[PDB]
Amino acid sequence: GSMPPPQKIPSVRPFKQRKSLAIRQEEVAGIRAKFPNKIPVVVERYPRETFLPPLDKTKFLVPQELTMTQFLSIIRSRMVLRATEAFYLLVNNKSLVSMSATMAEIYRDYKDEDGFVYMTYASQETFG
């Protein structure tokens, strides 16, 4: 018969996370209420990127007064690989590294359906 191949077949629980749409709304609901000044961002590694390995943390609860540029510094610090290389932090896989943009603005603009802000990092887009 025609059995379709399932997409994305990893381990049962590769990460002790497993957040469903509902659970995402719940945690974000708790976070928003418990920490009004903090915003939960989720930083994922660029699927085409091979230079920069997965970071120590995937989820960052940072102050809304925090800027893209200072967050960039945090990301580079949270790298499991030592590198002072230049890299771009893209928001919603689209927005560029607006150094003057705060997490506050970013959240209100790029809030996802689950309430989190998803960011993607890579050394160089398209590499070059």
Along the chain, the helix and strand elements come as HEEHEHE
CATH class type: Alpha Beta
* CATH fold descriptor: Ubiquitin-like (UB roll)
**Tally of strands:** 4
What gyration radius follows from the Cα positions, in whole Å? 16 Å
At the fourth level of CATH, the homologous superfamily is Phosphatidylinositol 3-kinase Catalytic Subunit, Chain A, domain 1
Overall geometry comes to globular
Which strand-content bin applies to the residues? 15-25%
Considering DSSP H and I runs of 4 or more, what fraction of the residues is helical? 25-40%
Number of helices: 3
Structural class: alpha+beta
In total, the number of domains comes to 1
In CATH, the architecture is: Roll
Strand ordering within the main sheet = 2-1-4-3
Could you characterize the architecture of this molecule?
The protein is α+β, with helices and mostly antiparallel strands and 128 residues long. The chain has one domain: Ubiquitin-like (UB roll), CATH 3.10.20.90. It contains 3 helices and 4 strands, in the order H-E-E-H-E-H-E. The longest helix has 14 residues, at 21-34. Keywords: Autophagy, Cytoplasm, Cytoplasmic vesicle, Cytoskeleton, Lipoprotein, Membrane, Microtubule, Phosphoprotein, Ubl conjugation pathway.
Topology:
Layout: H1 21-34, E1 38-45, E2 59-63, H2 68-77, E3 88-91, H3 103-110, E4 117-122
Parallel strand pairs: 1-4
Antiparallel strand pairs: 1-2, 3-4
